[PDB]
Short mmCIF file of C-alpha atoms and ligand atoms in Angstrom, two decimals:
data_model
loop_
_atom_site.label_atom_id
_atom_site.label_comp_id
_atom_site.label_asym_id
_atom_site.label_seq_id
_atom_site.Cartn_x
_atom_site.Cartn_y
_atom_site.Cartn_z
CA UNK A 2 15.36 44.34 -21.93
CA UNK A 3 16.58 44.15 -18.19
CA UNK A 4 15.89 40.99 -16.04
CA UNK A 5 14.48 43.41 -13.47
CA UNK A 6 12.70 40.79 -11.08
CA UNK A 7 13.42 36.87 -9.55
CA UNK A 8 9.97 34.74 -9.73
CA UNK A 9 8.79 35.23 -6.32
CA UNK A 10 6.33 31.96 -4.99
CA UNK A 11 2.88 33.17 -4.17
CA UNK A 12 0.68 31.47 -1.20
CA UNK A 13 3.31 28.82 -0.25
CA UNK A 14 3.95 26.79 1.45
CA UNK A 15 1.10 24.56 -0.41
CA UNK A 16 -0.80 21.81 2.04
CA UNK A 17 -3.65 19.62 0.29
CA UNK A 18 -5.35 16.70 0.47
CA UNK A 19 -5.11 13.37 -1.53
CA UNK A 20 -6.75 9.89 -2.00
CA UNK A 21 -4.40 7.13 -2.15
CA UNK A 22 -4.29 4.94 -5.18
CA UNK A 23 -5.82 8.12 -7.23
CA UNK A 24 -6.05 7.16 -10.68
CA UNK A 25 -2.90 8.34 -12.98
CA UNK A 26 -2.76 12.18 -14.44
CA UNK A 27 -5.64 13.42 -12.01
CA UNK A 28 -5.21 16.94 -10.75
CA UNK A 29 -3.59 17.44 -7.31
CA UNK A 30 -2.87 20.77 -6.79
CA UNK A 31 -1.40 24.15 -8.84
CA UNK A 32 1.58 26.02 -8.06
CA UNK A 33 2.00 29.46 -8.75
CA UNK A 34 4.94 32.21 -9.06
CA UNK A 35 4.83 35.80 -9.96
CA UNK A 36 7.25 37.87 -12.01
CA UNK A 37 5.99 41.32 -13.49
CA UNK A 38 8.68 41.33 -15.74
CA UNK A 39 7.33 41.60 -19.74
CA UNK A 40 8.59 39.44 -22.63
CA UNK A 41 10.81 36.28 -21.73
CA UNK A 42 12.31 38.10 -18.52
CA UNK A 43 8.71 37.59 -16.79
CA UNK A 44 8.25 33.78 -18.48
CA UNK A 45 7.72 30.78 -16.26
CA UNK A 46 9.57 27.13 -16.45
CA UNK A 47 8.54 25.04 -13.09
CA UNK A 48 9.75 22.14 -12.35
CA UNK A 49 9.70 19.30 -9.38
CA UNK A 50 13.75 19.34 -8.66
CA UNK A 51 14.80 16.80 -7.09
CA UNK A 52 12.35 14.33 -9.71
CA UNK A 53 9.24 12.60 -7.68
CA UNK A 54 8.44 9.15 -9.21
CA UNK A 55 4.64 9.93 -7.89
CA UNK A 56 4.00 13.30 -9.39
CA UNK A 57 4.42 15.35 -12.96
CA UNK A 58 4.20 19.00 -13.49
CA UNK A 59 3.16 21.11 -16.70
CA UNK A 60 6.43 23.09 -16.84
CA UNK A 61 4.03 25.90 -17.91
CA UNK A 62 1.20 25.99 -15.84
CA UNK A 63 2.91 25.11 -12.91
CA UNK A 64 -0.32 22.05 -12.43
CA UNK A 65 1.18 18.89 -10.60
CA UNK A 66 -0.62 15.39 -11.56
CA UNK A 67 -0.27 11.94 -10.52
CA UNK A 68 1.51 9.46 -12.48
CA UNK A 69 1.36 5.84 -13.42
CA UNK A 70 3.28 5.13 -10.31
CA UNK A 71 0.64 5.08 -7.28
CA UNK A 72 0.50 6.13 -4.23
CA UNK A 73 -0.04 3.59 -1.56
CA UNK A 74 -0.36 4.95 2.12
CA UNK A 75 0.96 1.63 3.90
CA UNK A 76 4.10 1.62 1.41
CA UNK A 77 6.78 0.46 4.57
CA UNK A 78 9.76 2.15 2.95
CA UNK A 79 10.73 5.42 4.85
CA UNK A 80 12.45 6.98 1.08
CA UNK A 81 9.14 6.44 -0.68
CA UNK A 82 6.71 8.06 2.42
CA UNK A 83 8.45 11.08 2.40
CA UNK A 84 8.12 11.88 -1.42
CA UNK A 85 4.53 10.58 -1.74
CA UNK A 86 3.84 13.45 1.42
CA UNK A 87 6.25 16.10 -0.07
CA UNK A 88 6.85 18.03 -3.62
CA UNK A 89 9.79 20.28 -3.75
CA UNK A 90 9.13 22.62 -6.43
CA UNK A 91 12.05 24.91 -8.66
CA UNK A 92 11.15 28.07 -10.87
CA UNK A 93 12.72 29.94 -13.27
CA UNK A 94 12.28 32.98 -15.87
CA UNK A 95 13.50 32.67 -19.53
CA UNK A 96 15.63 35.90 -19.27
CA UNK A 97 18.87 37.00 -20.40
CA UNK A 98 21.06 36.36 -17.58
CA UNK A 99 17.66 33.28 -16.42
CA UNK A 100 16.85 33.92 -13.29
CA UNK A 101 15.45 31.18 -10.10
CA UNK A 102 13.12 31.96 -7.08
CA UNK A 103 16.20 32.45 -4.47
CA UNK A 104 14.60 28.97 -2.78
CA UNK A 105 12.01 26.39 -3.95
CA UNK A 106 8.79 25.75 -2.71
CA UNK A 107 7.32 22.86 -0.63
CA UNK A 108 3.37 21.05 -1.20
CA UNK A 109 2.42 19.48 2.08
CA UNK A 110 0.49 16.10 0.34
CA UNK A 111 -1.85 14.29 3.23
CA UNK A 112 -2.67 10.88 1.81
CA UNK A 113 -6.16 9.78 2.32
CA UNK A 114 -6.69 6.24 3.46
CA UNK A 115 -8.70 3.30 1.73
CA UNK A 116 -9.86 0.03 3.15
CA UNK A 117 -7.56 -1.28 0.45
CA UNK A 118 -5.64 -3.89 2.44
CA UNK A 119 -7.70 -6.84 3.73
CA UNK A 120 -6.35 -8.58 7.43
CA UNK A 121 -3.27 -11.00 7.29
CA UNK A 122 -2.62 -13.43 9.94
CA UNK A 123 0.26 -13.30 12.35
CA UNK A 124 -0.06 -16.62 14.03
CA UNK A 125 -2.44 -18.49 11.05
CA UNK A 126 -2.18 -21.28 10.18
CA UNK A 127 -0.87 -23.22 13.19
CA UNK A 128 -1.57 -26.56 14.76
CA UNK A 129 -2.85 -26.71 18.24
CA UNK A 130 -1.41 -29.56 20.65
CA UNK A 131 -4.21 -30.94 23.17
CA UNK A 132 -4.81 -33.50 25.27
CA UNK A 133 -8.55 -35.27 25.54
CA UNK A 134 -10.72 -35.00 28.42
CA UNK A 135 -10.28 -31.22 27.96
CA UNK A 136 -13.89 -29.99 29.62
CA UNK A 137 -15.52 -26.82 28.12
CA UNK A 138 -14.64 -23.36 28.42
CA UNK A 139 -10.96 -23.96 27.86
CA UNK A 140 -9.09 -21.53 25.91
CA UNK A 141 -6.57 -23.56 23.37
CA UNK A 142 -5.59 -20.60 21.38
CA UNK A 143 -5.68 -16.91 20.57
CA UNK A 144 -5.94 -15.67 17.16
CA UNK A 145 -3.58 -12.48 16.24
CA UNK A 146 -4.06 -10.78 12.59
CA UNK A 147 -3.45 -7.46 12.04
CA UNK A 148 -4.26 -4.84 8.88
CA UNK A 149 -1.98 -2.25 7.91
CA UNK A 150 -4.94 0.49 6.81
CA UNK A 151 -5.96 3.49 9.66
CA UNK A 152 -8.66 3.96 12.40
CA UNK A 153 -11.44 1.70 11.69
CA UNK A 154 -10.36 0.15 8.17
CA UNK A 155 -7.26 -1.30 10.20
CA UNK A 156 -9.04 -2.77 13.40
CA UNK A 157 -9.23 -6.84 13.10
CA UNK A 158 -12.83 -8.60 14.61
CA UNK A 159 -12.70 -12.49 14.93
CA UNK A 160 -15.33 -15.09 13.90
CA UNK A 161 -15.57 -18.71 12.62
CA UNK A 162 -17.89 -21.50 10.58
CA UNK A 169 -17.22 -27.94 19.43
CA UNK A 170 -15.47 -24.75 19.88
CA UNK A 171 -16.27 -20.42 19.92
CA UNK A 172 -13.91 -17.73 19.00
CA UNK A 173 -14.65 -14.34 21.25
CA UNK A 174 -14.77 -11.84 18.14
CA UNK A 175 -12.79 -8.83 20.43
CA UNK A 176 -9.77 -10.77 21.89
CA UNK A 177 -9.33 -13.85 19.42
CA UNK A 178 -9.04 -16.46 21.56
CA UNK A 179 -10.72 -19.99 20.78
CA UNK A 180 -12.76 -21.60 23.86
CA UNK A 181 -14.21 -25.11 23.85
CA UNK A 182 -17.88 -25.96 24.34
CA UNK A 183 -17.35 -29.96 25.09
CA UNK A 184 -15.33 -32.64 26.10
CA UNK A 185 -12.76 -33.32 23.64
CA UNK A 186 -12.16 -37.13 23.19
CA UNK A 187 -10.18 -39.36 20.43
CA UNK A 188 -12.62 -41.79 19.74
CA UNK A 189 -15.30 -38.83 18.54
CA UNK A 190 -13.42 -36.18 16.74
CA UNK A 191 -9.55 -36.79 17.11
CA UNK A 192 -8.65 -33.59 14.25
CA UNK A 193 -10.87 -30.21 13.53
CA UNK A 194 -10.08 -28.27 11.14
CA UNK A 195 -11.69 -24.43 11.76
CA UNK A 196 -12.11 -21.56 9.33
CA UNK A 197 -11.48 -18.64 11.51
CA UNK A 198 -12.27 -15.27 9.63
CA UNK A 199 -10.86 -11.87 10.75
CA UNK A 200 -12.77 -8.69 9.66
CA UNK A 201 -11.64 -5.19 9.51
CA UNK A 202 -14.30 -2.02 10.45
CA UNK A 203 -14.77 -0.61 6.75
CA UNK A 204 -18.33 0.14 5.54
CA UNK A 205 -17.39 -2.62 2.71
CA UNK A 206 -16.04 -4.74 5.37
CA UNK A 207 -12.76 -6.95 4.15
CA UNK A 208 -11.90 -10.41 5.40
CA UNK A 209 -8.95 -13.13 5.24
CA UNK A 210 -9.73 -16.47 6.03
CA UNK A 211 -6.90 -19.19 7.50
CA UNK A 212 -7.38 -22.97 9.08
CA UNK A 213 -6.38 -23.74 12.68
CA UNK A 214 -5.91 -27.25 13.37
CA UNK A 215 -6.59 -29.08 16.96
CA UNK A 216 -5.05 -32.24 17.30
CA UNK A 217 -6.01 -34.01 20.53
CA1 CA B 301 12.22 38.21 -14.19
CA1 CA B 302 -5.29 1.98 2.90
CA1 CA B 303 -8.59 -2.97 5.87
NA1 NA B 304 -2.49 0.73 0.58
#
């Protein structure tokens, strides 16, 4: 009838691996404490103390799922980072006095990155002040966009639909003499790309008045 044992935490600390956006209630990872204790003194209750808005836990079987809440890898605030990357997880027995794990545990989550967020313009759209007579090979502009996803997903190409955009730098060269009484306003669709095997775009209009 003695509570002869605390819950003692068994392979932590837990590090795994995790897809961002991952659907609600799909598996993450399972926690797991040992107590040979019979009857209620022996009886697991986890629990994720303090709460995480991005994960639930089966008080029984110590299994942690996602919620309805998802988890989004470029989320800027510094609060919700941490919590999405880290579970702190308490224990207890049922016993008579109940007895904790004499400290918590900690699961390590590295999110997983999608090509989920397309390329936004910094300096799109703009309007371009030139004067005519401007020969060729003149740059007028450079085009800055940037994309908030990692490694190749997150690195911004340039390309458009009298003028040529180099697709590395983003900076807009002429190919003519610009005069007023031929085209005095062009209006150019520059679109930046991102490096994702379903490539994403983002499309925004500079304007050259002469
Ligand atoms: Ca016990
Ligand atoms: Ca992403
Ligand atoms: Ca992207
Ligand atoms: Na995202």
């Amino acid at each position: 009838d003695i509570n002869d044992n605390h819950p003692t935490w068994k392979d932590a600390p837990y590090y795994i691996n995790l897809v961002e956006m991952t659907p609600p209630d799909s598996d993450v990872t399972t926690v797991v404490a040992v107590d040979p204790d019979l009857g209620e003194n022996g009886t697991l209750v986890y629990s994720i103390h303090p709460p995480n808005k991005f994960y639930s836990l089966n008080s029984t079987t110590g299994k942690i799922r996602t919620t309805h809440v998802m988890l989004d890898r470029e989320n800027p605030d510094p609060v919700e980072a941490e919590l999405m990357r880290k579970i702190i997880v308490s224990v207890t027995d049922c016993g008579r006095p109940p007895l904790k794990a004499t400290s918590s545990a900690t699961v390590f989550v590295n999110l997983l990155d999608l090509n989920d967020n397309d390329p936004t313009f910094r300096n799109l759209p703009f309007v371009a002040e030139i004067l005519e007579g401007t020969p060729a090979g003149v740059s007028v502009y450079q085009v800055v966009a940037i994309d908030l996803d990692e490694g190749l997903n997150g690195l911004v190409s340039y390309r458009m639909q009298d003028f040529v955009i180099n697709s590395t730098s983003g900076v807009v060269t002429t190919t003519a003499e610009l005069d007023r009484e031929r085209i005095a306003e062009y209006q150019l669709r520059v679109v930046a790309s991102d490096a994702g095997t379903p490539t994403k775009s983002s499309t925004s209009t500079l304007t050259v008045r002469v």
